[PDB]
């Protein structure tokens, strides 16, 4: 079992992975081994999930008369710094100020193909609130022409400290 790390962008469009393997092979003398390199090509289809297995028969170490083991690649989601994968959905952490949470704001949501979609919020935004952007997730692997959703997930950032004069005022306006 060997990890096949695939980026969200790669799951989104599909891709071809080329993997160089170096394995032991029995020489013609039947007594000695050599290391030889081989390139294994993997088609990653649109929307494929973590855990998908891809098998290369007999590409393991050949040391003797035994058949070389199989090499089994297991698809792993490569961590992304903008989105978190959730099945066929993608989650976008939106970090906003407390002021923005309370007073309104526009989130310019980035997409997998590199656009931004502006989404305007007029009502109070709560910590951990989500908002769906339909059809902006990943292709469904069985039906690649349909897509999951992009989900905005809010993180509300508080001020580090609040001066006494601001406290006095917040006490007058915020409900008890």
């Amino acid at each position: 079992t060997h990890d096949l790390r695939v980026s969200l962008e790669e799951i989104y469009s599909g891709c071809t992975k080329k993997m160089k393997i170096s394995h032991k092979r029995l020489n013609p003398d039947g007594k000695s081994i050599r290391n030889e390199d081989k390139i294994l090509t993997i088609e990653v289809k649109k929307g494929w999930k973590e855990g998908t297995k891809i098998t290369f028969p007999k590409e393991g170490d050949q040391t003797s008369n035994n058949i070389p083991a199989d090499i089994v690649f297991v698809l792993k989601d490569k961590p992304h710094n903008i989105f978190k994968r959730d099945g066929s959905d993608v989650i976008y952490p939106a970090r906003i100020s407390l002021r923005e949470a309370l007073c309104g704001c526009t989130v310019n949501v980035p997409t997998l193909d590199g656009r931004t979609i502006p989404v305007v919020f007029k009502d109070v935004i709560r910590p951990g609130m989500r908002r769906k952007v339909p059809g902006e997730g990943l292709p469904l692997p069985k039906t690649p022409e349909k897509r999951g959703d992009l989900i905005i997930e809010f993180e509300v950032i508080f001020p580090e400290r609040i001066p006494q004069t601001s406290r006095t005022v917040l006490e007058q306006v915020l409900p008890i």
Binding site: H2, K17, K18, M19, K20, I21, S22, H23, K24, I39, E59, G60, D61, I71
Partner: peptide
């Protein structure tokens, strides 16, 4: 075991 890297 064999060595595996991307290329």
């Amino acid at each position: 075991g064999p060595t595996i890297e991307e290329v």
